[PDB]
Paper text:
The HIV-1 envelope glycoprotein (Env) is the sole target for neutralizing antibody (NAb) responses. The development and structural determination of soluble native-like Env trimer mimics, particularly ones based on the SOSIP technology, has provided a platform for structure-based immunogen design. Here, we describe a detailed characterization of neutralizing and non-neutralizing mAbs isolated from two rhesus macaques (RMs) previously immunized with the BG505 SOSIP.664 trimer.
RM20F recognizes an epitope spanning two gp41 protomers and a single gp120 protomer that has 1126 Å2 of BSA at the interface. In comparison to the FP-targeting bNAbs VRC34 and ACS202, RM20F lacked neutralization breadth when tested against a panel of multiple heterologous viruses likely due to the dependency on poorly conserved residues, such as 85 and 229. The epitopes of the FP-targeting bNAbs VRC34, ACS202, and DFPH-a.15 overlap to a large extent with the epitopes of RM20E1 and RM20F, with DFPH-a.15 and VRC34 also neutralizing more potently in the absence of the N611 glycan.
Residue numbers in the entry:
A (entry chain B): 1 to 213
B (entry chain A): 1 to 104, 108 to 227
């Protein structure tokens, strides 16, 4: 089979700049090479076919070139919705094969998160569990530190985090942190808080609530 | 206009046989070569089956002998029959239409893709999620806006899909990637930001769907 290599595996670029990602085949494939776009949770989308031929509906800022073994996809002016992974595909030898993909990240301005906290629902407490959620909304860069405090006691070993993909409109991220306790342990304490640290915050932010307030 | 619709996600055990299905809208399978392409979780794309207009089939050595692609144009149906499934077969399976060739038989590039069918191979059993509300409170407000959501806890396998107000509410929604719990089950949350002033007049319902277990839940999220 033909091995398709793409390098680098990740690019971080500013809006309106020009980007060129490369694809190399382990043997000559002429111009039987195509480019696809895919975002998390979505299906791939054809951008370019046979090295440089345009596709109906694709913005003109996309263009490709190359013949033989070295190929290049160029985005003339990078837009927010261009945050995605880009794959090349050879169709010269059976079976057709894809490259590993190059992920493009948008580099925007610093934006501090909006912090929210949710107490557990009475429906969940009736089942014997208590989940406390801390929400960090629309921030950049993706690095962020979240800490849980119960009655001012720093917690560890009882929480889990998850971060979203980059937003296709404002290029920000969002993060959720869930503290999970048993009903018995939840009713042993009164104050619950999450403390957030981020590059866009000159001082840490703390959202808290009192059990039964 | 032109699109592809596929069957739902499912969980099956090692060694099982399973059939997927895909149907066309505004075009006919009888005049277009069709293919199946899969994407393992966190991996790239792999073509696994193709059929030309004559009905001849193509397979790569990775799955030849285990996968069978077939077609029933009169029924508007494309099928992928898989057998002797194993962990390595866990992936999202897309049906894809071959693109128009420039030379005078598939071209092997794909101009149309379906939404994908997520198939998980595992020895565990399915479990539907429990949905709890994340009620908007004074601790989830800021500058006249309020955050609310739903918690989808303790399910297996992936994925669960979440919509709001039957798809009418999309702006400002964030559905986080699932997290793996110590018990082996998954959990996620879905949140949205709305005007605080309209919390009394508007209704906010999160729609959860877990096809592998045929579970559908609609939870009304009200302030508390």
């Amino acid at each position: 089979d033909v091995v398709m290599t793409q390098s680098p595996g990740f690019r971080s670029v500013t809006l309106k700049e020009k980007v060129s990602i490369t694809c190399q085949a382990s043997q000559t494939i002429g111009t039987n090479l195509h480019w696809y776009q895919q975002k998390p949770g979505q299906s791939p989308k054809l951008l370019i076919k046979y090295s440089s031929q345009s596709i109906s509906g694709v913005p003109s800022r996309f263009s490709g070139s190359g013949s033989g073994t070295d190929f290049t996809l160029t985005i003339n002016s990078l837009e927010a919705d261009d945050a995605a992974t880009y794959y090349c595909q050879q169709t010269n030898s059976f079976p057709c094969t894809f490259g590993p993909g190059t992920k493009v990240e948008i580099k925007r301005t610093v934006a501090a998160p909006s912090v929210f906290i949710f107490p557990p629902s009475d429906e969940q407490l009736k089942s014997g569990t208590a989940s406390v959620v801390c929400l960090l909304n629309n921030f950049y860069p993706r690095e962020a530190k979240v800490q849980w405090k119960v009655d001012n006691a720093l917690q560890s070993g009882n929480s889990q985090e998850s971060v979203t993909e980059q937003d296709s409109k404002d290029s920000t991220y969002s993060l959720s942190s869930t503290l999970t306790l048993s009903k018995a342990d939840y009713e042993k304490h009164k104050v619950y808080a999450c403390e957030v640290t981020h590059q866009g915050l000159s001082s840490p932010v703390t959202k808290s609530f009192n059990r039964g307030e | 206009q032109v699109q592809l619709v596929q069957s739902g996600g499912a969980l099956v055990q090692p060694g099982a046989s399973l059939r997927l299905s895909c149907a066309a809208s505004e075009f006919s399978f009888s005049t277009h070569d069709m293919h199946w392409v899969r994407q393992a979780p966190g991996k790239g794309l792999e073509w696994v089956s193709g059929i030309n207009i004559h009905g001849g089939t193509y397979y790569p050595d990775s799955v030849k002998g285990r996968f069978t692609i077939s077609r029933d144009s009169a029924k508007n149906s494309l099928y992928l029959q898989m057998s002797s499934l194993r962990d390595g077969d866990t992936a999202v399976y897309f049906c894809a239409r071959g693109g128009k060739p420039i030379y005078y038989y598939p071209s092997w590039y794909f101009d149309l893709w379906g939404p994908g069918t997520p198939i998980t191979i595992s020895s565990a059993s399915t479990k539907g999620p429990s949905v709890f509300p994340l009620a908007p409170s004074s601790k989830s407000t800021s500058g006249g806006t309020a955050a609310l959501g739903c918690l989808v806890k303790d399910y297996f396998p992936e994925p669960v899909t979440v919509s709001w107000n039957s798809g009418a509410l999309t702006s400002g929604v964030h559905t986080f990637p699932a997290v793996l719990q110590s018990s082996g089950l998954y959990s996620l949350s879905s949140v949205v930001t709305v005007p605080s002033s309209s919390l009394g007049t508007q209704t906010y319902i999160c729609n959860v769907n877990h096809k592998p277990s045929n579970t559908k839940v609609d939870k009304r999220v009200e302030p508390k």
